[PDB]
Amino acid sequence: IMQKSNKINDALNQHYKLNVELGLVYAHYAHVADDEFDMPYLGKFIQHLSEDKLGVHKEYISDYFKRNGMKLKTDVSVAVKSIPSDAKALIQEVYARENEVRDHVKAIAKLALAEDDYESFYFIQWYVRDGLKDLTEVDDVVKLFNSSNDKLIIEETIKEMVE
Amino acid sequence: IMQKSNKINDALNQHYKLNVELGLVYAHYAHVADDEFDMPYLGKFIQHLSEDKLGVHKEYISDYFKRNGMKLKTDVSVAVKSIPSDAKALIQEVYARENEVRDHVKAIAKLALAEDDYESFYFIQWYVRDGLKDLTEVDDVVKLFNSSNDKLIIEETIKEMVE
Amino acid sequence: IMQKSNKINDALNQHYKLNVELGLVYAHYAHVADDEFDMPYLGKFIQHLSEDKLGVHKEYISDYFKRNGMKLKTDVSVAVKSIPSDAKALIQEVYARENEVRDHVKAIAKLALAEDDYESFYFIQWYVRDGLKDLTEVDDVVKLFNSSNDKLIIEETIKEMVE
Amino acid sequence: IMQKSNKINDALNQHYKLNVELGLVYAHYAHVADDEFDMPYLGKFIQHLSEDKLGVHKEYISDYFKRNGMKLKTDVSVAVKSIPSDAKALIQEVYARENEVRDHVKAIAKLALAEDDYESFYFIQWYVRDGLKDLTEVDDVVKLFNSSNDKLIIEETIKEMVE
Amino acid sequence: IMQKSNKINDALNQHYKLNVELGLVYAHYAHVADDEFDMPYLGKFIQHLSEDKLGVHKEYISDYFKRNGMKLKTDVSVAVKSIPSDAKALIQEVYARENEVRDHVKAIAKLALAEDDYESFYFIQWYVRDGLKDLTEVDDVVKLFNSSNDKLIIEETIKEMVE
Amino acid sequence: IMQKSNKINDALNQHYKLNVELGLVYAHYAHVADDEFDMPYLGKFIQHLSEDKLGVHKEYISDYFKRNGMKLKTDVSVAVKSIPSDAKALIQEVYARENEVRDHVKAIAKLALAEDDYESFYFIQWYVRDGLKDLTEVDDVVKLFNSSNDKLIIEETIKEMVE
Ligand SMILES: [Fe+3]
Ligand SMILES: [Fe+3]
Ligand SMILES: [Fe+3]
Ligand SMILES: [Fe+3]
Ligand SMILES: [Fe+3]
Ligand SMILES: [Fe+3]
Ligand SMILES: [Fe+3]
Ligand SMILES: [Fe+3]
Ligand SMILES: [Fe+3]
Ligand SMILES: [Fe+3]
Ligand SMILES: [Fe+3]
Ligand SMILES: [Fe+3]
Ligand SMILES: [Fe+3]
Ligand SMILES: [Fe+3]
Ligand SMILES: [Fe+3]
Ligand SMILES: [Fe+3]
Ligand SMILES: [Fe+3]
Ligand SMILES: [Fe+3]
Ligand SMILES: [Fe+3]
Ligand SMILES: [Fe+3]
Ligand SMILES: [Fe+3]
Ligand SMILES: [Fe+3]
Ligand SMILES: [Fe+3]
Ligand SMILES: [Fe+3]
Ligand SMILES: [Fe+3]
Ligand SMILES: [Fe+3]
Ligand SMILES: [Fe+3]
Ligand SMILES: [Fe+3]
Ligand SMILES: [Fe+3]
Ligand SMILES: [Fe+3]
Ligand SMILES: [Fe+3]
Ligand SMILES: [Fe+3]
Ligand SMILES: [Fe+3]
Ligand SMILES: [Fe+3]
Ligand SMILES: [Fe+3]
Ligand SMILES: [Fe+3]
Ligand SMILES: [Fe+3]
Ligand SMILES: [Fe+3]
Ligand SMILES: [Fe+3]
Ligand SMILES: [Fe+3]
Ligand SMILES: [Fe+3]
Ligand SMILES: [Fe+3]
Ligand SMILES: [Fe+3]
Ligand SMILES: [Fe+3]
Ligand SMILES: [Fe+3]
Ligand SMILES: [Fe+3]
Ligand SMILES: [Fe+3]
Ligand SMILES: [Fe+3]
Ligand SMILES: [Fe+3]
Ligand SMILES: [Fe+3]
Ligand SMILES: [Fe+3]
Ligand SMILES: [Fe+3]
Ligand SMILES: [Fe+3]
Ligand SMILES: [Fe+3]
Ligand SMILES: [Mg+2]
Ligand SMILES: [Mg+2]
Ligand SMILES: [Mg+2]
Ligand SMILES: [Mg+2]
Ligand SMILES: [Mg+2]
Ligand SMILES: [Mg+2]
Question: For C18-161, where are the E strands, in sequence order?
Fold first, then answer.
């Protein structure tokens, strides 16, 4: 009498895929921030976000599926074929992707209510809140590039954020 | 006077890609071991191996590239399109893939000597040793399925291995 | 039945001499960084590298010779007859010399294999790894001069590196 | 795709046999050093070397075989049919045998590279280093017999070495 | 007025030889128990018994000889030319050899009284008691193979015995 | 109104050079004491003196120059082209060089007073005292070779001095 929603199943499989692929992209951007742009703390901030997407962001869905009978799907393809031209544009790109996360998460909450899937509406509340948190942390680094022209000042300020 | 080997660069980019894709496959197999085969400790063993491949196995290469000027490439595609039929065949599949890792790692060591790239030969020694270690840990779980017909006995024995 | 290689003996005596003379040059550059360029932390970084070259870098060879019957040779001549014009070029010079160290160390590893001197190949692995480490630490200071125009910002950033 | 080298298998079985038989000989020499030559600390030094050869020196090979599918062979024959005439010649004999160990270990490293068996080249690095260490510790006792004519002085000096 | 018995000297040299050769055989059986029969705890039990035979069982005799003027003889030959077909028969074989130890030890006690060698009768009391102890510990593992058909149950039970 | 004395500048640059070159010679003699003469504690005593000359003895001058505007000069050449024939003559040679240090240091103090350079007279007081201290410590080892014919007795006595 509690059959899982296929629509929610698909939307969460899509979101699983987004977090894997985002995490793989951020792992690359973390590398570039350190190696090419000489900003290892910016690299550490982005690497932390990468391990976040490839960790709890995907594991919570996988665990959730175990409990309710939804089917997990692993279908992944991502190629980092060009890189932003400097550190500001790099973190600006990360921002734009985190903003899209908020839009994807919102669609899932809306769908969960349309499906009368209150377990799924409960489960997604965490993503609803974290969408704004991850976006805010990234926004706190974007602001640094408009507040100083000095890479090492910026780096020094980031070091108190991923501490 | 210390220009990086393109051949080693490619072979390590390929190995980076193998560890990402293997890690994504193992994350799926971990899920199935718990959810479908009712073996959450086998699932915990495979999840640990997944986080190993998607963690230090790929990060050491990325860090190494930063030091020597090799170029990191992120080009990933993996789809888990069928799953082994039971827990024994699942861990047997994991075994077969770890055995292939040893063959890939051996080719890189051999290439590093052919290139007179002793930094790369040093760097790969860790993978040379870990290839046998990961294979042995997986082999220690395969043996359980030939030693008992009782899933819960096996599960109980695995619990002292990923402890 | 285990007679020491004269070729390895000479190559390690040459490397002993390189580390003494490099260490004496860096001791001078450390002085100049502090006294002339007003960068005492850059001076502390270079002094640490000096004591590294004049310490374990030369002592490991001397100890090794004691064990295998190779002959130690002390033949040293170095004069610091001009100094780079500013702090950036100073650390750039240190970089260029550490990069040459990697090339010298690589020749010794290659020779050890050609001689079937596996004790010497083992012994040099430490230098193979440290060549990249010392180069990376120096590279981490070079990057600072391209990341800021402010000596005191740079100095402040170096202070968290030789801490 | 990772089939074990029979040549390495044989060379390591031979080395297993050497460490057993050497250990049995040293256990006898330890006895004689104490009982016949009145040098119990020299006896303790040689007994420690005996337990070294009959312990980790043979166990590491046996463990290694478990991991890679090589076959262990136990084929042992040793008879101590004459004993050196005094303590100096006793420790001189031990020295000569440890020097031969270095030659045997070197042949195995060389063979491992010829076989492209990098797991075996990794595994033998420990023996490559320990060959010089055991030889050096034994050499440190040989030197005592050329530095003093007084057994009890020598004994007293050995007591700070196997401490 | 206290001249050592040659008969006891020979019987203890023979027993020294038995403990060396038994210890070498058990080291091999320990390997097989783990590697071939997938029972590493059974392997750990047999390895412990091996180090027992090759340790105090032989050292007590060697020490005893030092005190009373008996001559130590090292004459060793052992080849493990076939292995029992499964774990039960392996531990059954170990049992049969430990039972023979009790018979050999009993002959020495009897001889010591016939020789009026009360020091030797005292010295052998330890072996008289340990013969039954080692036999009992081995018997406690034999019983497991008649109490369960499940290798992993047996393994789990052995793990609380060599703990 | 406080212009640095060129004469003191030269005399301290010469003394800087003496301590570097002496330190390099002692590092070699330390090696020989251990390796050739079988006296590792004598080697440890001489190595400590080497690190003394190449450390504070040269660094105090370099630091002093930073404070008063004197120019540091690095002009070093030393070759150890023959070695004394035995341990006594080795330490006798070290003694003779430390005695010359006292004469060089005395000339600098005398010059500092002739120049009315009381900062330089203050600065050299440390060297005035250390000249006698280093000479006394070396003299305490020379005395050992006239007090015993037994290398190991001497070695044992040195071990309580560089402790
Ligand atoms: Fe569907
Ligand atoms: Fe976080
Ligand atoms: Fe599921
Ligand atoms: Fe792209
Ligand atoms: Fe940038
Ligand atoms: Fe998050
Ligand atoms: Fe600041
Ligand atoms: Fe700060
Ligand atoms: Fe701060
Ligand atoms: Fe290419
Ligand atoms: Fe692990
Ligand atoms: Fe890079
Ligand atoms: Fe598939
Ligand atoms: Fe199953
Ligand atoms: Fe691993
Ligand atoms: Fe249990
Ligand atoms: Fe249990
Ligand atoms: Fe338990
Ligand atoms: Fe030569
Ligand atoms: Fe350092
Ligand atoms: Fe030497
Ligand atoms: Fe110059
Ligand atoms: Fe400057
Ligand atoms: Fe270094
Ligand atoms: Fe700060
Ligand atoms: Fe600050
Ligand atoms: Fe700070
Ligand atoms: Fe064969
Ligand atoms: Fe030891
Ligand atoms: Fe085996
Ligand atoms: Fe013999
Ligand atoms: Fe003697
Ligand atoms: Fe050893
Ligand atoms: Fe003493
Ligand atoms: Fe004493
Ligand atoms: Fe003492
Ligand atoms: Fe007899
Ligand atoms: Fe026991
Ligand atoms: Fe004896
Ligand atoms: Fe047999
Ligand atoms: Fe079996
Ligand atoms: Fe026993
Ligand atoms: Fe149980
Ligand atoms: Fe239990
Ligand atoms: Fe238990
Ligand atoms: Fe002048
Ligand atoms: Fe001192
Ligand atoms: Fe200056
Ligand atoms: Fe000379
Ligand atoms: Fe001498
Ligand atoms: Fe001094
Ligand atoms: Fe004494
Ligand atoms: Fe003493
Ligand atoms: Fe003492
Ligand atoms: Mg409604
Ligand atoms: Mg070649
Ligand atoms: Mg060759
Ligand atoms: Mg080849
Ligand atoms: Mg009677
Ligand atoms: Mg006057």
Answer: 75-79
